[PDB]
Design a protein around this motif. Structure first.
Motif, PDB file in Angstrom:
ATOM      1  N   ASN A   1      30.344  42.997  25.061  1.00  0.00           N
ATOM      2  CA  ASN A   1      29.892  43.366  26.399  1.00  0.00           C
ATOM      3  C   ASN A   1      29.528  42.127  27.210  1.00  0.00           C
ATOM      4  O   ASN A   1      28.785  41.264  26.745  1.00  0.00           O
ATOM      5  CB  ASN A   1      28.689  44.305  26.312  1.00  0.00           C
ATOM      6  N   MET A   2      30.056  42.046  28.427  1.00  0.00           N
ATOM      7  CA  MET A   2      29.785  40.914  29.305  1.00  0.00           C
ATOM      8  C   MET A   2      30.053  39.594  28.589  1.00  0.00           C
ATOM      9  O   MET A   2      29.203  38.705  28.568  1.00  0.00           O
ATOM     10  CB  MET A   2      28.336  40.956  29.794  1.00  0.00           C
ATOM     11  N   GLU A   3      31.241  39.476  28.004  1.00  0.00           N
ATOM     12  CA  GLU A   3      31.620  38.264  27.285  1.00  0.00           C
ATOM     13  C   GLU A   3      31.785  37.091  28.247  1.00  0.00           C
ATOM     14  O   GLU A   3      31.340  35.978  27.967  1.00  0.00           O
ATOM     15  CB  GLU A   3      32.920  38.489  26.510  1.00  0.00           C
ATOM     16  N   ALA A   4      32.428  37.348  29.381  1.00  0.00           N
ATOM     17  CA  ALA A   4      32.651  36.315  30.385  1.00  0.00           C
ATOM     18  C   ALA A   4      31.349  35.608  30.743  1.00  0.00           C
ATOM     19  O   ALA A   4      31.293  34.379  30.803  1.00  0.00           O
ATOM     20  CB  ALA A   4      33.286  36.918  31.630  1.00  0.00           C
ATOM     21  N   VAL A   5      30.301  36.391  30.981  1.00  0.00           N
ATOM     22  CA  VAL A   5      28.998  35.839  31.333  1.00  0.00           C
ATOM     23  C   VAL A   5      28.490  34.895  30.249  1.00  0.00           C
ATOM     24  O   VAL A   5      28.426  33.681  30.447  1.00  0.00           O
ATOM     25  CB  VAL A   5      27.958  36.953  31.556  1.00  0.00           C
ATOM     26  N   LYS A   6      28.132  35.459  29.101  1.00  0.00           N
ATOM     27  CA  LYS A   6      27.631  34.668  27.983  1.00  0.00           C
ATOM     28  C   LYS A   6      28.308  33.302  27.935  1.00  0.00           C
ATOM     29  O   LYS A   6      27.655  32.280  27.722  1.00  0.00           O
ATOM     30  CB  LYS A   6      27.861  35.409  26.663  1.00  0.00           C
ATOM     31  N   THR A   7      29.622  33.290  28.138  1.00  0.00           N
ATOM     32  CA  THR A   7      30.387  32.051  28.119  1.00  0.00           C
ATOM     33  C   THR A   7      29.888  31.079  29.183  1.00  0.00           C
ATOM     34  O   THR A   7      29.625  29.911  28.896  1.00  0.00           O
ATOM     35  CB  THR A   7      31.889  32.314  28.345  1.00  0.00           C
ATOM     36  N   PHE A   8      29.757  31.570  30.410  1.00  0.00           N
ATOM     37  CA  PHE A   8      29.288  30.744  31.517  1.00  0.00           C
ATOM     38  C   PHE A   8      27.833  30.333  31.310  1.00  0.00           C
ATOM     39  O   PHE A   8      27.434  29.225  31.667  1.00  0.00           O
ATOM     40  CB  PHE A   8      29.433  31.499  32.840  1.00  0.00           C
ATOM     41  N   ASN A   9      27.046  31.234  30.730  1.00  0.00           N
ATOM     42  CA  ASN A   9      25.635  30.964  30.477  1.00  0.00           C
ATOM     43  C   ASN A   9      25.465  29.713  29.621  1.00  0.00           C
ATOM     44  O   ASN A   9      24.397  29.101  29.604  1.00  0.00           O
ATOM     45  CB  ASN A   9      24.983  32.162  29.783  1.00  0.00           C
ATOM     46  N   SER A  10      26.526  29.338  28.913  1.00  0.00           N
ATOM     47  CA  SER A  10      26.493  28.161  28.054  1.00  0.00           C
ATOM     48  C   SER A  10      26.886  26.909  28.831  1.00  0.00           C
ATOM     49  O   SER A  10      26.258  25.858  28.695  1.00  0.00           O
ATOM     50  CB  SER A  10      27.433  28.349  26.861  1.00  0.00           C
TER      51      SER A  10
END
Length: 152
Positions: free
Chosen positions: A9-18
């Motif tokens: 869920n919300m994989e794209a985000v987590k990625t950017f959060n890094s």
């Protein structure tokens, strides 16, 4: 045997959060290539950009007085892409950032001042590329000066 996943869920985000916070790893200036590594994550999480934008505003307040310049760039590099890739009328970071853009810049204008130039330079480019309305940048240009330029 085989092995792999289909994201979460919300994989794209987590990625950017890094990538957003990842900046910490690098010290200003930020590797030209780095600034891109973040945008690629943001523009990708556009669907959930709702989280990205926020993080971009928070990380700025959490970061150090020295990382006040980088953040600004992260926002530009993003808005610039989304505004193009998807379009200006489609962009989501542009109209979304303009909401509290002020509060966001305020945390960036906190720098010792010798870094404000890197923050005021972006505004000049935005108004040019038509990234933001003059009614929004006009003030952002002053916030840097702080009730006028330091005259002594």
């Amino acid at each position: 045997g085989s092995s792999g996943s289909s994201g979460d869920n919300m994989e794209a985000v987590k990625t950017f959060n890094s990538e957003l916070y990842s900046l910490n790893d690098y010290k200003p200036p930020i590797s030209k290539a780095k600034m891109t590594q973040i945008t690629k994550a943001a523009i990708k999480a556009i669907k959930f950009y709702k989280h990205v934008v926020q993080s971009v505003e928070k990380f700025i307040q959490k970061c150090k007085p020295e990382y006040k310049v980088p953040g600004l760039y992260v926002i530009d590099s993003i808005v610039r892409q989304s505004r193009h890739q998807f379009g200006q009328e489609k962009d989501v970071f542009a109209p979304r950032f303009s909401n509290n853009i002020i509060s966001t810049f305020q945390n960036l204008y906190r720098c010792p001042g010798d870094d404000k130039s890197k923050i005021v330079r972006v505004l000049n480019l935005w108004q040019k590329n038509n990234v933001f309305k003059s009614e929004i940048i006009q003030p952002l240009l002053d916030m840097a000066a702080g009730s006028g330029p330091s005259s002594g």
